[PDB]
Write an enzyme that holds these catalytic residues in place. Sequence first.
Site, PDB file in Angstrom:
ATOM      1  N   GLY A 154      25.071  60.350 -15.769  1.00 18.17           N
ATOM      2  CA  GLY A 154      25.990  61.185 -14.670  1.00 18.17           C
ATOM      3  C   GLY A 154      25.346  61.027 -13.145  1.00 18.17           C
ATOM      4  N   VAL A 213      21.109  60.395 -13.323  1.00 14.16           N
ATOM      5  CA  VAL A 213      20.478  61.262 -14.454  1.00 14.16           C
ATOM      6  C   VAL A 213      20.638  60.307 -15.422  1.00 14.16           C
ATOM      7  CG1 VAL A 213      20.725  63.129 -15.833  1.00 14.16           C
ATOM      8  CG2 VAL A 213      21.348  63.577 -13.612  1.00 14.16           C
ATOM      9  N   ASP A 239      25.228  77.935  -7.655  1.00 13.91           N
ATOM     10  CA  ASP A 239      25.854  76.583  -8.003  1.00 13.91           C
ATOM     11  C   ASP A 239      26.520  76.911  -9.424  1.00 13.91           C
ATOM     12  OD1 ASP A 239      27.157  74.214  -7.950  1.00 13.91           O
ATOM     13  OD2 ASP A 239      25.556  72.989  -7.602  1.00 13.91           O
ATOM     14  N   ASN A 251      24.146  63.702  -5.783  1.00 12.51           N
ATOM     15  CA  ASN A 251      23.875  63.226  -4.479  1.00 12.51           C
ATOM     16  C   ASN A 251      22.495  62.724  -4.421  1.00 12.51           C
ATOM     17  OD1 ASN A 251      25.796  62.828  -2.787  1.00 12.51           O
ATOM     18  ND2 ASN A 251      25.589  64.872  -1.601  1.00 12.51           N
TER      19      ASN A 251
HETATM   20  C1  CG9 Z   1      19.632  68.711 -19.661  1.00  9.95           C
HETATM   21  C2  CG9 Z   1      19.771  68.457 -18.361  1.00  9.95           C
HETATM   22  N1  CG9 Z   1      20.864  67.691 -18.093  1.00  9.95           N
HETATM   23  C3  CG9 Z   1      21.365  67.557 -17.039  1.00  9.95           C
HETATM   24  C4  CG9 Z   1      22.541  66.632 -17.122  1.00  9.95           C
HETATM   25  C5  CG9 Z   1      23.286  66.212 -15.884  1.00  9.95           C
HETATM   26  C6  CG9 Z   1      24.160  65.161 -15.913  1.00  9.95           C
HETATM   27  C7  CG9 Z   1      24.806  64.558 -14.794  1.00  9.95           C
HETATM   28  C8  CG9 Z   1      24.594  65.327 -13.652  1.00  9.95           C
HETATM   29  C9  CG9 Z   1      25.024  65.253 -12.285  1.00  9.95           C
HETATM   30  N2  CG9 Z   1      24.498  66.285 -11.389  1.00  9.95           N
HETATM   31  N3  CG9 Z   1      23.644  66.998 -12.239  1.00  9.95           N
HETATM   32  C10 CG9 Z   1      23.493  66.507 -13.569  1.00  9.95           C
HETATM   33  C11 CG9 Z   1      22.936  66.954 -14.634  1.00  9.95           C
HETATM   34  N4  CG9 Z   1      23.082  66.339 -18.201  1.00  9.95           N
HETATM   35  C12 CG9 Z   1      22.473  66.697 -19.277  1.00  9.95           C
HETATM   36  N5  CG9 Z   1      22.939  66.270 -20.496  1.00  9.95           N
HETATM   37  C13 CG9 Z   1      24.236  65.539 -20.673  1.00  9.95           C
HETATM   38  C14 CG9 Z   1      24.626  65.081 -22.070  1.00  9.95           C
HETATM   39  C15 CG9 Z   1      25.709  64.357 -22.295  1.00  9.95           C
HETATM   40  C16 CG9 Z   1      26.325  63.798 -21.253  1.00  9.95           C
HETATM   41  N6  CG9 Z   1      27.759  63.022 -21.429  1.00  9.95           N
HETATM   42  C17 CG9 Z   1      28.261  62.836 -22.670  1.00  9.95           C
HETATM   43  C18 CG9 Z   1      29.708  62.569 -22.671  1.00  9.95           C
HETATM   44  O1  CG9 Z   1      30.136  61.477 -21.841  1.00  9.95           O
HETATM   45  C19 CG9 Z   1      29.302  61.761 -20.470  1.00  9.95           C
HETATM   46  C20 CG9 Z   1      28.037  61.997 -20.312  1.00  9.95           C
HETATM   47  C21 CG9 Z   1      26.027  64.254 -20.145  1.00  9.95           C
HETATM   48  C22 CG9 Z   1      25.073  64.832 -19.790  1.00  9.95           C
HETATM   49  C23 CG9 Z   1      21.114  67.482 -19.403  1.00  9.95           C
HETATM   50  N7  CG9 Z   1      20.702  67.779 -20.552  1.00  9.95           N
END
Ligand code: CG9
Length: 263
Positions: A16, A23, A127, A19
């Site tokens: 993902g 990640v 947030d 700003n």
């Molecule tokens: C622990 C802390 N985390 C933080 C973020 C995360 C992802 C993007 C952003 C943008 N700003 N902050 C974020 C935090 N994402 C986490 N897990 C996560 C698991 C699966 C996805 N997906 C799966 C489906 O297709 C899109 C991406 C996506 C994520 C996660 N696990």
Amino acid sequence: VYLDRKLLTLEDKELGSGNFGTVKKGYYQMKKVVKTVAVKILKPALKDELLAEANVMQQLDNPYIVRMIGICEAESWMLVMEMAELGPLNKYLQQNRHVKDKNIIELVHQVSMGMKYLEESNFVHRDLAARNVLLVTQHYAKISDFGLSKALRADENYYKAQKWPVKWYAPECINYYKFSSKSDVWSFGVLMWEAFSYGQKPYRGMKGSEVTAMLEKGERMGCPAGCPREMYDLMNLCWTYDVENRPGFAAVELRLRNYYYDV
Ligand SMILES: c1cn2cc(-c3ccc4cn[nH]c4c3)nc(Nc3ccc(N4CCOCC4)cc3)c2n1
């Protein structure tokens, strides 16, 4: 609390973006086993924000708050967290339309238990939104993204600011820049709105200034097709205009705890 870059591998599939930067999924070699992690990788001050987020995350110990493994002074700054694999609660429901509704109660409760913990710890999230609710399993969610959070002074029950998710903010945050657990409570109602909307954006089409007017007029979001009754009635209580009348997480969890039991 510092980590060894060499012990850390990063998959190329970016998870993902925000700003601060990106990640990525990754794996961190622990004592004996490897841990699946999600890692915030910092692309002119965002650093401090990131360490602020780690500072907060470092003091939080609770089953419904994402755990931080550590930080890595590697190529860029990295914040390494334990992986919640199903990802953000909005995007998930956006493509799991046909998820029971009783499953959602159990989920938003967990959120509220995590948020209670945060209230009692005198930290404010600032947030709180479905996108910041991460799923471990379809029946386990955790709160993440403490980038805006603040630890409250021992002498005050709110933080005062000197770029905002306006649609998630209580009137007082917008009018006076005042952020308390009660403000988080407001957001928690918008969060519940989202959840029970299978991931729809709140206030679709409206601008912040227009959302601000609607609320002052005493108007609130309509009930989402299919939501139970108390869950909408909980949302409206969360959306109490006057701070002092708005329920705290202590309260909102309490009711939350029950209602589910009876489902
Ligand atoms: C622990 C802390 N985390 C933080 C973020 C995360 C992802 C993007 C952003 C943008 N700003 N902050 C974020 C935090 N994402 C986490 N897990 C996560 C698991 C699966 C996805 N997906 C799966 C489906 O297709 C899109 C991406 C996506 C994520 C996660 N696990």
